[PDB]
Amino acid sequence: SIQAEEWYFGKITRRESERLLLNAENPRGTFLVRESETTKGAYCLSVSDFDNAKGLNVKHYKIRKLDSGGFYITSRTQFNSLQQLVAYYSKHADGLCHRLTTVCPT
Numbered sequence: 221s222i223q224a225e226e227w228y229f230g231k232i233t234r235r236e237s238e239r240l241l242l243n244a245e246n247p248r249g250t251f252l253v254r255e256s257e258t259t260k261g262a263y264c265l266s267v268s269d270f271d272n273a274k275g276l277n278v279k280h281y282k283i284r285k286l287d288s289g290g291f292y293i294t295s296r297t298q299f300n301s302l303q304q305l306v307a308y309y310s311k312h313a314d315g316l317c318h319r320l321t322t323v324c325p326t
């Protein structure tokens with residue numbers, strides 16, 4: 221299901237997510253979800269941002285999944301699925317560097 225998602229890159233490193241997201245063609249909010257390098261059972265949402273200060277850059281947010289079922293970056297805002305979390309952050313920037321816009325091209 222999660223593996224079925226085109227934005228789910230699975231087991232790729234933080235550096236690789238950065239290589240992919242640092243493409244000059246990527247607008248703010250370009251993103252992907254991957255496994256956390258060191259936190260078992262956790263995912264990482266990698267997102268491109270851009271400003272005149274830093275230019276094109278990348279941020280990483282940890283996504284936790286409870287056995288109790290919920291998915292979240294902040295425990296205050298949980299979802300019944302990773303798909304629903306992605307859909308929510310595609311509408312709300314909240315504390316992220318930018319709302320999610322486009323799936324990172326390979």
Ligand SMILES: *C(=O)c1ccccc1OP(=O)(O)OCC1CCCCC1
Nearest residue numbers: 234256257258259263264280281282
């Ligand atoms: C996502 O998993 C994440 C969130 C914030 C900052 C960095 C990451 O990417 P990661 O795969 O390097 O970090 C998750 C792992 C490795 C680094 C320390 C935290 C656990």
